[PDB]
Amino acid sequence: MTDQAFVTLTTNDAYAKGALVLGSSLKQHRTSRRLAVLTTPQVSDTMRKALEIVFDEVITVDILDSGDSAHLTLMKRPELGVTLTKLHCWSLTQYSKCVFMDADTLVLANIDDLFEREELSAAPDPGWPDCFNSGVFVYQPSVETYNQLLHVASEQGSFSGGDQGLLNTFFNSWATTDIRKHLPFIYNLSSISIYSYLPAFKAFGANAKVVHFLGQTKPWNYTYDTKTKSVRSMTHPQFLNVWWDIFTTSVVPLLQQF
Amino acid sequence: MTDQAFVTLTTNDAYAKGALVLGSSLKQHRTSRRLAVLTTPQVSDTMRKALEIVFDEVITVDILDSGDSAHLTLMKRPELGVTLTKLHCWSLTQYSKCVFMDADTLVLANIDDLFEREELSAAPDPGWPDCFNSGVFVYQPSVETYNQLLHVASEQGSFSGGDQGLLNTFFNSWATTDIRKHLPFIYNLSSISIYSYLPAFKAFGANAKVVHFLGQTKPWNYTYDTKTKSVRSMTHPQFLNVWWDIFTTSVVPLLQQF
Ligand SMILES: O=c1ccn([C@@H]2O[C@H](COP(=O)(O)OP(=O)(O)O[C@H]3O[C@H](CO)[C@@H](O)[C@H](O)[C@H]3O)[C@@H](O)[C@H]2O)c(=O)[nH]1
Numbered sequence: 001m002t003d004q005a006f007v008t009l010t011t012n013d014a015y016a017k018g019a020l021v022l023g024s025s026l027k028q029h030r031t032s033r034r035l036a037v038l039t040t041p042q043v044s045d046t047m048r049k050a051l052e053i054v055f056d057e058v059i060t061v062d063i064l065d066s067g068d069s070a071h072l073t074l075m076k077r078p079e080l081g082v083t084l085t086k087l088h089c090w091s092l093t094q095y096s097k098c099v100f101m102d103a104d105t106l107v108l109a110n111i112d113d114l115f116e117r118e119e120l121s122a123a124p125d126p127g128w129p130d131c132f133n134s135g136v137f138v139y140q141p142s143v144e145t146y147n148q149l150l151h152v153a154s155e156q157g158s159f160s161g162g163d164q165g166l167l168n169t170f171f172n173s174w175a176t177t178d179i180r181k182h183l184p185f186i187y188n189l190s191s192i193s194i195y196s197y198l199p200a201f202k203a204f205g206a207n208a209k210v211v212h213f214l215g216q217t218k219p220w221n222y223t224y225d226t227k228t229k230s231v232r233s234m235t236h237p238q239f240l241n242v243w244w245d246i247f248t249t250s251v252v253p254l255l256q257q258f
Numbered sequence: 259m260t261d262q263a264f265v266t267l268t269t270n271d272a273y274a275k276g277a278l279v280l281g282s283s284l285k286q287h288r289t290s291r292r293l294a295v296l297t298t299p300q301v302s303d304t305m306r307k308a309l310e311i312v313f314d315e316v317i318t319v320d321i322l323d324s325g326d327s328a329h330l331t332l333m334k335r336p337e338l339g340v341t342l343t344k345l346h347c348w349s350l351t352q353y354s355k356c357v358f359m360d361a362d363t364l365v366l367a368n369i370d371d372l373f374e375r376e377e378l379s380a381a382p383d384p385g386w387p388d389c390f391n392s393g394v395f396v397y398q399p400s401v402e403t404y405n406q407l408l409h410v411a412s413e414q415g416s417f418s419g420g421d422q423g424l425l426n427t428f429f430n431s432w433a434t435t436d437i438r439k440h441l442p443f444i445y446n447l448s449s450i451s452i453y454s455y456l457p458a459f460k461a462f463g464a465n466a467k468v469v470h471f472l473g474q475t476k477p478w479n480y481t482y483d484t485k486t487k488s489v490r491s492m493t494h495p496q497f498l499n500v501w502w503d504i505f506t507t508s509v510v511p512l513l514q515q516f
């Protein structure tokens with residue numbers, strides 16, 4: 001399956017660290033698919049070079065450029081910068097099917113079985129469960145769908161200020177149609193749901209395949225003691241500690257060659 | 259449909275106020291079904307008499323009595339008092355299909371369409387969306403199912419300390435099977451999801467058919483100014499104010515005849 005991939009996104013260096021750890025986690029669990037990352041010119045050349053190693057393909061998108069198809073739409077709704085860049089994940093017509101994953105996710109086990117799913121497949125979002133979380137989703141690249149999402153972004157925008165309301169408005173049958181398009185929550189496990197909902201977590205939380213660090217606080221916003229191999233501080237740091245083990249073990253030395 | 263009903267529960271007087279408002283909301287939106295409430299001896303005679311007016315049937319359950327089928331199980335796991343009482347909702351074999359509703363819910367529109375659903379149908383729980391919320395669900399009374407839930411309550415208990423983990427463990431195919439058994443979130447809208455998730459709410463929150471007051475703070479734990487017709491105090495009190503309008507308008511005067 002050379003025409004299938006995991007696709008992530010990073011518009012800066014902080015998020016590139018996430019992209020790097022995520023990509024490493026993917027390789028660590030032996031994925032048979034291609035690894036792709038959408039990037040912007042604002043990503044440093046040192047970060048960019050590390051991504052060229054972790055990823056099979058590094059694509060460069062620049063919506064600030066008048067030559068991009070999303071530029072006009074960025075002028076009309078300038079707050080949607082990250083969202084419009086994200087939508088270019090549907091432009092990767094070199095792939096037949098992809099699994100989009102936020103740069104703040106971490107893969108804990110092989111998830112190649114997601115490629116059995118069809119567009120649009122995604123896990124429920126905690127908070128408002130009739131909306132799917134846009135941090136992890138299965139889609140099929142297409143110029144027609146992309147132009148269609150751009151159009152909707154222009155005329156309506158997003159009810160959340162981010163891509164989530166836009167993707168839910170466009171793929172509106174998700175809640176009431178096809179249970180198969182409802183990815184098990186363990187494929188996009190919100191870290192907030194882990195420390196908060198202790199019961200539900202203690203019961204199914206060990207089955208987690210993908211952790212999603214949703215809060216204000218990303219993993220790279222923590223301090224990690226290298227001796228003790230643990231973050232400094234609240235009830236379940238084991239997930240932050242794995243992110244840092246990967247970053248410290250495989251990402252940091254990789255960045256030292258620059 | 260004389261053999262179909264909405265079934266609620268109350269083990270004391272505080273929750274009976276909820277049961278009373280809920281039952282009134284049901285009548286207010288003209289339900290064609292029967293109204294039933296499970297009660298305990300601990301419910302005052304004044305509360306009991308008000309329930310006999312709002313409800314078509316008031317059933318009395320006493321698990322503290324050695325003569326109840328759940329008593330033995332209550333001795334083995336005494337923390338499950340409210341849960342084991344709740345499970346008697348499956349003993350109401352006088353009805354072919356029922357919609358169980360927590361005493362802390364409020365019906366904002368006719369929801370007779372829920373009787374088209376089969377057991378077990380329920381809305382996703384915010385927090386851990388692969389588990390359904392047990393505050394609103396469609397089921398079919400049965401002695402066999404009841405004995406089966408009792409058995410599971412005895413051997414395993416509940417992973418949440420309440421009925422939710424027990425019902426999810428028993429009806430375990432909910433997450434991955436039949437999108438029809440996934441009731442739209444508007445049929446069991448968590449009030450926490452209303453004030454917290456402002457975006458998602460502002461977009462679909464006006465479609466709400468049932469509000470569920472999940473917090474530590476129930477509606478009866480608020481102070482309601484009768485002149486201004488509003489609770490004293492955080493972003494969306496309109497739902498608390500409707501609960502109090504119903505309580506003040508239809509429940510309080512009804513209780514004065516005692
Ligand atoms: O400066 C930025 C910000 C974001 N991103 C990318 O965009 C993704 C989305 O943003 P993130 O910072 O990870 O946001 P979340 O905490 O995951 O949340 C947002 O995105 C979730 C799913 O994507 C939604 O559930 C939330 O409502 C929304 O607030 C990130 O993972 C990155 O891949 C960048 O590249 N650069």
Ligand SMILES: O=c1ccn([C@@H]2O[C@H](COP(=O)(O)OP(=O)(O)O[C@H]3O[C@H](CO)[C@@H](O)[C@H](O)[C@H]3O)[C@@H](O)[C@H]2O)c(=O)[nH]1
Nearest residue numbers: 267268269270273340360361362391392393420422472473
């Ligand atoms: O002393 C009591 C306590 C509860 N109840 C009844 O039991 C229902 C459940 O309890 P409630 O106080 O309403 O709890 P919730 O805030 O709604 O939450 C609990 O129940 C939810 C769904 O029932 C789950 O999502 C939560 O995890 C669980 O903590 C109530 O509505 C009542 O009908 C009584 O009759 N007497």
Ligand SMILES: [Mn+2]
Nearest residue numbers: 102104135214
């Ligand atoms: Mn994210």
Ligand SMILES: [Mn+2]
Nearest residue numbers: 360362393472
């Ligand atoms: Mn409740």
